[PDB]
Amino acid sequence: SDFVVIKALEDGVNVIGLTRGADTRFHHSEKLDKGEVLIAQFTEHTSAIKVRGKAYIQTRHGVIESEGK
Amino acid sequence: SDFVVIKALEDGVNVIGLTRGADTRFHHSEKLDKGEVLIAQFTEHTSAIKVRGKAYIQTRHGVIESEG
Amino acid sequence: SDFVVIKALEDGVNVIGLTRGADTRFHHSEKLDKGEVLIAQFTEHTSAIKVRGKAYIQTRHGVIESEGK
Amino acid sequence: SDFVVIKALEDGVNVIGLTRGADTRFHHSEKLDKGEVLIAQFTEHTSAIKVRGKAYIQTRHGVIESEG
Amino acid sequence: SDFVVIKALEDGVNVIGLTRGADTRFHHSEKLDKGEVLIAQFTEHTSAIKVRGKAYIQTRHGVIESEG
Amino acid sequence: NSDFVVIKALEDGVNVIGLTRGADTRFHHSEKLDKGEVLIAQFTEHTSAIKVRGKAYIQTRHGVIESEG
Amino acid sequence: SDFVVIKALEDGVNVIGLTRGADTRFHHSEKLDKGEVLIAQFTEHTSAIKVRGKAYIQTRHGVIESEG
Amino acid sequence: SDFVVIKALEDGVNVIGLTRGADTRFHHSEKLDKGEVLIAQFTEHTSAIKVRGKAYIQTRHGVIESEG
Amino acid sequence: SDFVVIKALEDGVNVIGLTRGADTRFHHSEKLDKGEVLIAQFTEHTSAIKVRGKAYIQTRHGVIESE
Amino acid sequence: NSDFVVIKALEDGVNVIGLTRGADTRFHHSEKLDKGEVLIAQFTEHTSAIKVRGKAYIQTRHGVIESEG
Amino acid sequence: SDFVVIKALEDGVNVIGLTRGADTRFHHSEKLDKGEVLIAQFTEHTSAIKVRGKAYIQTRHGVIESEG
Ligand SMILES: N[C@@H](Cc1c[nH]c2ccccc12)C(=O)O
Ligand SMILES: N[C@@H](Cc1c[nH]c2ccccc12)C(=O)O
Ligand SMILES: N[C@@H](Cc1c[nH]c2ccccc12)C(=O)O
Ligand SMILES: N[C@@H](Cc1c[nH]c2ccccc12)C(=O)O
Ligand SMILES: N[C@@H](Cc1c[nH]c2ccccc12)C(=O)O
Ligand SMILES: N[C@@H](Cc1c[nH]c2ccccc12)C(=O)O
Ligand SMILES: N[C@@H](Cc1c[nH]c2ccccc12)C(=O)O
Ligand SMILES: N[C@@H](Cc1c[nH]c2ccccc12)C(=O)O
Ligand SMILES: N[C@@H](Cc1c[nH]c2ccccc12)C(=O)O
Ligand SMILES: N[C@@H](Cc1c[nH]c2ccccc12)C(=O)O
Ligand SMILES: N[C@@H](Cc1c[nH]c2ccccc12)C(=O)O
Numbered sequence: 093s094d095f096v097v098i099k100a101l102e103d104g105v106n107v108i109g110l111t112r113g114a115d116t117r118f119h120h121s122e123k124l125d126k127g128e129v130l131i132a133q134f135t136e137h138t139s140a141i142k143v144r145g146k147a148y149i150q151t152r153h154g155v156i157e158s159e160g161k
Numbered sequence: 162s163d164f165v166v167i168k169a170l171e172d173g174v175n176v177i178g179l180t181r182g183a184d185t186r187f188h189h190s191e192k193l194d195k196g197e198v199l200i201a202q203f204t205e206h207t208s209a210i211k212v213r214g215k216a217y218i219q220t221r222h223g224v225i226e227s228e229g
Numbered sequence: 230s231d232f233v234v235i236k237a238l239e240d241g242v243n244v245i246g247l248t249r250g251a252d253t254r255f256h257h258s259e260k261l262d263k264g265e266v267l268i269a270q271f272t273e274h275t276s277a278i279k280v281r282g283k284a285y286i287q288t289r290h291g292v293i294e295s296e297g298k
Numbered sequence: 299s300d301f302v303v304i305k306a307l308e309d310g311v312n313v314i315g316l317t318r319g320a321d322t323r324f325h326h327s328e329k330l331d332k333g334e335v336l337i338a339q340f341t342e343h344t345s346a347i348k349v350r351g352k353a354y355i356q357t358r359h360g361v362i363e364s365e366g
Numbered sequence: 367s368d369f370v371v372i373k374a375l376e377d378g379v380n381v382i383g384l385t386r387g388a389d390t391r392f393h394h395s396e397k398l399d400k401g402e403v404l405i406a407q408f409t410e411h412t413s414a415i416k417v418r419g420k421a422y423i424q425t426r427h428g429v430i431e432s433e434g
Numbered sequence: 435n436s437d438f439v440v441i442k443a444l445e446d447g448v449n450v451i452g453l454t455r456g457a458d459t460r461f462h463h464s465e466k467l468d469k470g471e472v473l474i475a476q477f478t479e480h481t482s483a484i485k486v487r488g489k490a491y492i493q494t495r496h497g498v499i500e501s502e503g
Numbered sequence: 504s505d506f507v508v509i510k511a512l513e514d515g516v517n518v519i520g521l522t523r524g525a526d527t528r529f530h531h532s533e534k535l536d537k538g539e540v541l542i543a544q545f546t547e548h549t550s551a552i553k554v555r556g557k558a559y560i561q562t563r564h565g566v567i568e569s570e571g
Numbered sequence: 572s573d574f575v576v577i578k579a580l581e582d583g584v585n586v587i588g589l590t591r592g593a594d595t596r597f598h599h600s601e602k603l604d605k606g607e608v609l610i611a612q613f614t615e616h617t618s619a620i621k622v623r624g625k626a627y628i629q630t631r632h633g634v635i636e637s638e639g
Numbered sequence: 640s641d642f643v644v645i646k647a648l649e650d651g652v653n654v655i656g657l658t659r660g661a662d663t664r665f666h667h668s669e670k671l672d673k674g675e676v677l678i679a680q681f682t683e684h685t686s687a688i689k690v691r692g693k694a695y696i697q698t699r700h701g702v703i704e705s706e
Numbered sequence: 707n708s709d710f711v712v713i714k715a716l717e718d719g720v721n722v723i724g725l726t727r728g729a730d731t732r733f734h735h736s737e738k739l740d741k742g743e744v745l746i747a748q749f750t751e752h753t754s755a756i757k758v759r760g761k762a763y764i765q766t767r768h769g770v771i772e773s774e775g
Numbered sequence: 776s777d778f779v780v781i782k783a784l785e786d787g788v789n790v791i792g793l794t795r796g797a798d799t800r801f802h803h804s805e806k807l808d809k810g811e812v813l814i815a816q817f818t819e820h821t822s823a824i825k826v827r828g829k830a831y832i833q834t835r836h837g838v839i840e841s842e843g
Contacts, residue, residue, distance in 0.1 A: 127502030140201035153219035159196025228264035296333030359424035365401030433538030470638025493632035564697035570674030606774030629768035706810030742842030
């Protein structure tokens with residue numbers, strides 16, 4: 093199973109997990125402050141991940157950046 | 162299992178999941194504001210994903226860009 | 230399972246899924262307008278995909294471009 | 299499971315499925331007009347595919363071109 | 367399974383499937399006219415394929431050409 | 435056979451925080467690393483996301499990244 | 504399952520299947536004339552193949568040539 | 572299943588296996604003297620490995636060095 | 640399952656199969672004359688292959704030559 | 707189907723030591739190689755770590771490393 | 776399963792199979808004379824292989840030579 097790496101480039105970045113299945117909703121929001129790194133899988137409970145806030149992101153398709161608010 | 166990355170290049174980008182199965186219609190729409198990123202899999206319930214609005218998209222087959 | 234990326238290059242492009250099985254017919258036609266991208270898998274119900282209209286297409290075998298009537 | 303990409307280079311190109319099984323006969327012929335693209339898998343029902351008419355073809359082994 | 371691409375370079379090219387199993391015989395002969403392309407798998411019924419006539423062939427192992 | 439991440443502490447007191455797999459998300463363990471130590475940590479039945487706090491050099495299958503304290 | 508491609512470079516080339524199992528013997532010999540191609544899998548019944556006569560051979564390990 | 576190579580660059584390098592499971596603690600410490608190499612897998616009992624001391628380390632993600 | 644290609648460079652080459660299992664002995668020796676090629680898998684009955692005589696060999700690990 | 711390590715002894719008395727798989731970790735076998743002998747050894751149901759003592763040239767899937775006596 | 780290629784560069788080379796399991800002992804030694812090649816797998820019965828005498832060895836991790 094795949095994972096994404098998220099490094100917060102400012103305070104208060106959210107890494108948000110969306111529910112797997114017929115229902116889609118946020119089930120968790122992980123707050124990152126500046127310089128922290130989260131490495132998060134897709135899972136039986138999370139089939140999509142949203143990042144909000146300025147962050148440097150790595151996936152198997154390469155580098156992407158989210159831009160803040 | 163495959164996934165796509167969608168980065169919104171303007172407010173109100175719409176990432177649209179189409180139902181897997183004999184029937185096709187959309188079952189969820191996730192809107193992204195400018196600069197937000199969605200990383201979304203193909204799943205038991207989603208077998209096609211449509212993007213409306215200006216977005217920078219990555220998949221296993223490279224970069225593509227939707228325009229609004 | 231494989232997927233194809235289709236970006237409409239004009240209004241009214243149709244991505245048509247053909248039924249899997251002994252029977253071959255169109256079960257769904259997804260209409261795309263200029264600029265929209267559809268990323269569609271092959272599935273239990275769709276074993277061939279036809280694209281009518283001007284579009285830019287990526288698959289595992291590379292880029293190809295459909296041209297409209 | 300693999301697939302083949304067929305772009306028609308003139309009107310009336312035929313993409314023909316041959317039946318999987320002890321028996322080999324046609325089963326379906328999909329007509330493509332000029333510029334249309336069909337992306338077709340090998341399947342439980344189809345184990346060989348013939349292209350007749352002028353088309354640009356991509357498979358995992360590269361590009362090939364049929365001639366009418 | 368693996369598949370082979372065969373493009374007929376002259377009329378009346380034969381792509382022949384040999385039966386899988388203890389016994390080996392021809393079960394099917396597919397005639398290609400000049401310019402036609404056959405994309406053909408190995409299958410439950412076919413474990414060897416013979417090409418007779420001038421054709422351009424692609425397999426996972428690269429290009430080879432049969433001659434009349 | 436899961437993926438793993440390599441974390442090298444670049445200062446004392448780095449925290450490698452495992453987050454619970456499953457419907458609920460919480461920290462189940464924080465492994466504290468001192469400067470120069472290396473932890474090689476898999477994703478597992480119990481850990482589906484890993485958070486790093488403090489200064490560290492990190493390797494994953496998508497490349498190098500650095501967390502900052 | 505792997506396969507070998509054999510192009511006959513002269514008449515009467517023999518592609519010989521050896522039986523899988525405790526016993527080893529030839530169960531089939533396919534004769535190729537000049538310019539014919541045979542693409543042949545390893546199978547439940549065939550676990551070694553022998554080529555006799557002048558031919559051009561491709562496998563996963565590259566090209567090799569048998570001589571008469 | 573993955574493995575880590577550890578080469579001790581001084582005496583008393585400690586390779587520490589952490590328990591797989593809901594609980595985390597060390598269940599084994601294997602000390603290495605200078606110049607000894609340990610090639611250790613992840614296992615049913617070890618899902619994280621800590622190295623203390625000066626060591627040269629290879630994993631599938633490249634080389635890394637611990638400092639003691 | 641993997642295979643070996645053997646091309647005989649002289650008459651009389653032997654490609655010998657060794658039994659899988661607790662015991663090890665030769666169960667078959669295939670003779671190759673000059674220029675003949677054998678392509679031979681590992682199998683349920685053969686877990687090691689010995690080549691005697693001069694031949695050009697290819698495996699997944701590249702070319703080697705017996706003498 | 708498991709991974710394996712190649713060990714070439716560069717002096718006499720090199721020991722390739724197998725550590726037990728499971729909850730118990732101990733040495734269960736020590737293979738003595740003299741100069742120039744090679745051992746190609748798999749990870750196994752019984753051996754989940756391998757220790758080399760003495761001067762040896764080692765190849766893994768991660769590359770070459772050398773042990774020093 | 777992986778395999779190793781051993782080419783003996785002098786007479787009397789020994790390729791030694793070590794038992795799989797909790798017990799480790801030699802179960803077989805195959806003697807190779809100069810210029811003989813043995814291609815040997817890992818198996819249910821053989822989880823380590825030792826070579827004694829001068830030989831050129833190939834494995835998935837490259838070339839290594841043993842010296843007598
Ligand atoms: N308990 C969550 C943890 C998690 C994994 N990846 C995530 C991405 C975003 C938010 C939460 C997560 C899960 O197993 O699914
Ligand atoms: N609940 C949806 C979440 C999802 C995944 N990928 C998507 C793409 C578009 C819209 C929703 C989604 C699912 O598991 O299928
Ligand atoms: N319900 C359809 C959705 C779909 C996937 N790929 C397609 C290609 C074309 C048309 C529709 C589709 C299916 O699961 O098959
Ligand atoms: N119903 C057909 C659809 C199809 C797929 N590939 C084809 C190639 C040619 C013609 C038809 C097809 C099948 O599943 O087999
Ligand atoms: N009905 C045949 C179709 C076929 C596939 N590959 C072929 C090659 C040659 C001749 C026939 C075929 C089969 O399933 O085996
Ligand atoms: N007992 C934990 C060990 C672990 C693995 N990776 C981790 C990452 C962070 C914290 C603990 C861990 C587990 O099996 O999941
Ligand atoms: N009936 C034979 C056909 C065959 C496949 N590969 C071959 C190689 C040589 C001779 C015959 C064959 C089989 O399934 O095994
Ligand atoms: N009947 C033998 C044929 C064989 C395959 N590879 C070999 C190598 C050497 C000798 C015989 C063979 C088997 O299936 O094992
Ligand atoms: N008996 C332990 C041995 C082990 C493997 N890798 C390790 C890393 C560190 C310490 C011990 C180990 C196990 O099977 O898990
Ligand atoms: N009968 C032995 C044959 C063997 C395979 N590989 C070897 C390596 C060395 C010595 C003997 C062997 C086995 O199946 O295990
Ligand atoms: N009987 C041991 C043999 C072995 C394989 N690899 C080893 C490495 C070191 C020592 C012994 C071994 C086992 O099957 O596990």
